[PDB]
Amino acid sequence: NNFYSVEIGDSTFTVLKRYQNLKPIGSGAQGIVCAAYDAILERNVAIKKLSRPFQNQTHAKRAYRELVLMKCVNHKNIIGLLNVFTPQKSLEEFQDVYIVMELMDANLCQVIQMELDHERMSYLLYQMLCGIKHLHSAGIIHRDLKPSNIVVKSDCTLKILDFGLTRYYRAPEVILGMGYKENVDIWSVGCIMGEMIKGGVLFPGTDHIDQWNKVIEQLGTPCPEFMKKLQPTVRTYVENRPKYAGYSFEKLFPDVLFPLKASQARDLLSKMLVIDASKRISVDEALQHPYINVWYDPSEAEAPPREHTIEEWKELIYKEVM
């Protein structure tokens, strides 16, 4: 009696009465998401119904993981958990999980191709980095940052949408079969910043192989040291491409593309868009760069941080919901 049902295409959203005005804004293999209005908090929310969370151990494992990280991770620059519920009254009946988040106005896809001043550019990038740093502190490395999984509001605030693991924003480590570390996420920040400046995708590969070619065409073929780190099968392709010199960052990002500040942005870009991760800038150095550091606030940029059966996952998830 505290709940009601709304049909959402072929899916039924059975939710607390506080949530009205439901409307589907997205879906994927793991869930359906509706925009809604929360009559109790008097604010807009996003409600995600998880998809087939108990179909197998793998689905259950992810559902449990997603739920635990959203609860335990807290930072203004990371999508937060407002509420979690199940419409079922018992563990025996337990089937469905709904996650409630603050409703953001947009992702970054269009915004970054509009023309932003330095202040907006750098402030958005500062917030991204603060968000990413907090993920890394919690032992979460994203590996898949892109504009579509970064959300904003009309008040110029920003949150990262998910905890990760379109190929334009993938680092070289990922493109190829390499090991990664923290600064894998810096590449994606680089691609995004560049795009804010350029007004279009930096490295728009037509396929997974072409993504590499687009990068090296602009940045240059990486040195032999790096080639040695590649697995034999991928090394055979990569090493035998024509040799590109790359263009300087002055040529890639000349003054005329921008709205000292351009010089500072270029310098930072030249340190993030580095193919060889062992030569790429880190998150901490990025936050300390004069282009980003102007917004510095320690409370934001230094914030304090197996095997089961389906029924055991059901129970672990149920406890987490209650």
Partner: peptide
Amino acid sequence: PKRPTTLNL
């Protein structure tokens, strides 16, 4: 330097 408080969608 004051933080932007608006963003055009």
